[PDB]
Design an enzyme around this catalytic site. Structure first.
Site, mmCIF file in Angstrom:
data_model
loop_
_atom_site.group_PDB
_atom_site.id
_atom_site.type_symbol
_atom_site.label_atom_id
_atom_site.label_comp_id
_atom_site.label_asym_id
_atom_site.label_seq_id
_atom_site.Cartn_x
_atom_site.Cartn_y
_atom_site.Cartn_z
ATOM 1 C CG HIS A 1 32.775 -3.580 37.353
ATOM 2 N ND1 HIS A 1 31.539 -4.022 37.774
ATOM 3 C CD2 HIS A 1 32.716 -2.227 37.367
ATOM 4 C CE1 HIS A 1 30.757 -2.980 38.004
ATOM 5 N NE2 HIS A 1 31.447 -1.880 37.761
ATOM 6 C CG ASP B 1 26.116 1.410 29.541
ATOM 7 O OD1 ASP B 1 25.164 0.685 29.903
ATOM 8 O OD2 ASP B 1 26.936 1.891 30.354
ATOM 9 N NE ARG C 1 19.170 -0.353 32.694
ATOM 10 C CZ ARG C 1 20.354 -0.759 33.147
ATOM 11 N NH1 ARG C 1 21.468 -0.406 32.519
ATOM 12 N NH2 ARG C 1 20.429 -1.519 34.237
ATOM 13 C CB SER D 1 25.111 -1.652 31.788
ATOM 14 O OG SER D 1 25.726 -0.479 32.267
ATOM 15 C CE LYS E 1 29.731 1.072 32.954
ATOM 16 N NZ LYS E 1 28.284 0.931 32.663
#
Ligand SMILES: O=c1ccn([C@@H]2O[C@H](CO)[C@@H](O)[C@H]2O)c(=O)[nH]1
Ligand SMILES: O=c1ccn([C@@H]2O[C@H](CO)[C@@H](O)[C@H]2O)c(=O)[nH]1
Lengths: 432, 432
Positions: free
Chosen positions: B81, B160, B167, B182, B186
């Site tokens: 990521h 999330d 948020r 978060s 994921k």
């Protein structure tokens, strides 16, 4: 996007008047949803507001609804607000007291959900006394007698009603700017020209330490300076309950004592102090010293009491309660809670005395409960007093004999030391 | 009352695992309303969370939905990521690159709303390439070829999705524990056994200063340590765009160059670094040094490119784009933006290059927009390069000639100094 308003406060920046007006108007009308308002309130909790911001917030909440027009009542309109606490009978005494020297008392109030009855609940202890007059009769009675009471019916500060409810469910009540603006906006919308505040301090108070009490008082006085409503604040002690009586009928009886100059010493001094400020701000005396002298004279000469009799009778009440307090609702049972040992009273835990009174049924818990106005308690020892084993520390007034839990809570709330204890300071300081 | 959970965090206290689980479950299902969750998130913004809290939050969000089962794909599943940024082609290169040395790449992704197309949008530049396979064919292709791509369809981390949206509208995105949980939740819900993170730093990055980038990287590595998913993070530079191409088809063409060992130097070094960690964590090499050597060899010997060809062909794409990139969508117009003076490139403002690409239409803005995959830009000078007046700083690829605003934004984004400038550091540090 409205999010910017949240971010700005979160980052510590000062909102402009335009931005405060916009956020309050949009929240009030529904344009700004509750989750954005609650994020904003939490950001305020952490970052606070300047004096200009707090005054803008106050006036935005005033403008969200109607403002009571008291222009037909002659004179300056001075109002009093206290955060209150256990045994605070000042509102019952102060009205007749200041009215007796010419201060117009146009009292508007509503039945509360607090730990005792509100002013209306308490005054309804007086047989026949009812507050169901229209605004015209209200004005007439204030101009004739210098005092009257009505139930608040105006759509006042709807934004404050909404925001305070939200604060209550989001852990954002405990914020000085939010508290200051809420209290002041309500008093301004009710038509006050000038405001006297009794900010409590100590374990029985809203602000649980002196620094915070002083910051709150300062914040509200500054609001008043900027919105053109002269405001003075006294910081007073709630480390113990005020006076002796906690309840409804019982506090009316004590207020009658106080109006005759034979009440508890602390309540007498507090009412003389607050009332001197009210008289001065109302311009019914040339100085605080003159105002104090006038109130001491009104008490000793019996004029404040006669004023109370006029007030009661004018709205249906049996003023003879002043001569014969047994006409107030009487409790079916009385119990003397005896001291377990010799000593000196070092503390009376105010919150726990309040809880005991609530357990007896002296307060309201659901929006509309019916309250037994006869029940409650009368303390007989205050901090600094000497006590002998077996002496009555407090009388418990109840509608049944099943009060073991009340006895235990009260016994634990009255703390004795084996050596002498000093009286606490009642009046700490005046902020103006 | 749920308010206590807000108050506890507001006061700086650590929530327990039970409390985090309770709040996430109740918010997910609707028991805890948005205004309480947003007050809670703002309290977190100010007071933060411990490592134990952050890991509990991550796993509560994982547990809120389904977890993809990759047990039928042989080998450790390692996922990557990045917060990403302008020109980040790494995902297009890294898949074939690590798969060519035996790392299984079970890629699941969904079409984004970002500043360029997602991985799927970009790969659809390849004629015939489509991602509409079921899970069985997906597993089969990964076990056969060591790589495949599918569109995410699982109900992953619904908590999330909900909380990040909230948020986004309450100014509580910018919180390290909320970001860390978060992202990691994921990746865990997608079935990663181990995770490699590219945390960007500099003006073009999510965290706009190095300290914050390092804190985020550390937070995510610690989550991984506590939830049993080994996680390693590289902090890399986004002070300027990565590589040359910004777009869709243009970034595929550049990725092809990179797989052949003739891409931009920065992208090559970044892909070799991230890929060495992926290979090692997947246990397809005995050390990071061996992993790096294997990837350099795969590139130079042409095996990573052949892997890309297999990947494209297996899901309908015309692999001949590797030999003939003109089969990617071609732009109707090309414009050379000439340098206004002699000098040295001192800055390329990444955010503004991204905005320019968006203005050309390289990205999506509404949930579903159709994107012209041909458009975008190719930078020809990076920070540290010498430039002569009149030399092309960037080629603009557009579907019309009405691009004056793009020209002006790009011209202003490329900053020249009159004296030489050093290359910035690409790889700052590795956190593990
Ligand atoms: O935000 C606040 C806090 C307190 N109060 C007043 O203070 C009392 C509690 O101390 C409340 O009943 C109310 O009258 C307000 O009006 N607003
Ligand atoms: O709370 C956050 C912040 C960022 N991101 C990831 O980081 C990208 C932006 O840097 C987003 O698109 C998303 O993929 C999250 O998943 N959650």
């Amino acid at each position: 996007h409205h999010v910017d308003l949240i971010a700005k406060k979160r980052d510590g920046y000062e909102l402009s008047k335009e931005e405060i007006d916009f956020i309050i108007r949009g929240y009030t009308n529904g344009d700004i949803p509750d989750y954005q308002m609650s994020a904003f309130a939490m950001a305020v909790f952490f970052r606070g507001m300047t004096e200009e911001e707090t005054a803008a917030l106050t006036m935005a909440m005033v403008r969200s609804g109607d403002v009571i027009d008291l222009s037909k009542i002659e004179g300056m309109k001075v109002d009093k607000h206290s955060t209150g606490g256990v045994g605070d009978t000042t509102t019952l005494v102060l009205g007749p007291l200041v009215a007796s020297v010419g201060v117009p008392v146009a009292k508007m109030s509503g039945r509360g959900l607090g730990h005792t009855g509100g002013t209306i609940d308490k005054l309804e202890s007086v047989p026949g006394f009812h507050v169901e007059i229209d605004n015209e009769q209200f004005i007439e009675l204030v101009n004739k007698n210098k005092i009257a009471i009505i139930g608040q019916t105006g759509n006042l500060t709807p934004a404050d009603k909404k925001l305070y409810a939200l604060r209550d469910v989001t852990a954002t009540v405990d914020s000085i700017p939010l508290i200051a603006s809420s209290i002041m906006s309500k008093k301004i919308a009710a038509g006050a020209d000038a405001i006297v505040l009794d900010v409590k301090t100590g374990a029985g108070a809203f602000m649980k330490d002196f620094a915070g009490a002083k910051r709150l008082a300062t914040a509200m006085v500054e609001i008043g300076k900027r919105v053109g409503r002269k405001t003075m604040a006294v910081i007073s002690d709630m480390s113990q309950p005020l006076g002796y009586a906690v309840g409804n009928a019982l506090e009316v009886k004590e207020a009658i004592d106080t109006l005759k100059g034979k009440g508890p010493e602390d309540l007498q001094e507090l009412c003389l102090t607050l009332g001197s400020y009210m008289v001065y701000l109302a311009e019914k005396a040339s100085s605080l010293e003159e105002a104090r002298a006038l109130l001491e004279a009104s008490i000793r000469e019996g004029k404040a009491l006669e004023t109370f009799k006029v007030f009661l009778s004018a709205q249906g009440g049996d003023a003879s309660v002043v001569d014969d307090p047994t006409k107030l609702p009487q409790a079916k049972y009385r119990w003397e809670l005896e001291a377990p040992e010799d000593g000196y009273v070092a503390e009376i835990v105010a919150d726990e005395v309040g809880t005991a009174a609530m357990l007896l049924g002296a307060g309201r818990a659901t929006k509309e409960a019916t309250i037994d106005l006869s029940v409650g308690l009368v303390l007989h020892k205050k901090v600094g007093d000497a006590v002998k084993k077996g002496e009555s520390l407090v009388t418990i007034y109840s509608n049944t004999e099943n009060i073991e839990e009340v006895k235990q809570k009260l016994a634990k709330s009255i703390r004795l030391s084996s050596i002498p204890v000093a009286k606490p300071t009642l009046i700490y300081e005046t902020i103006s």
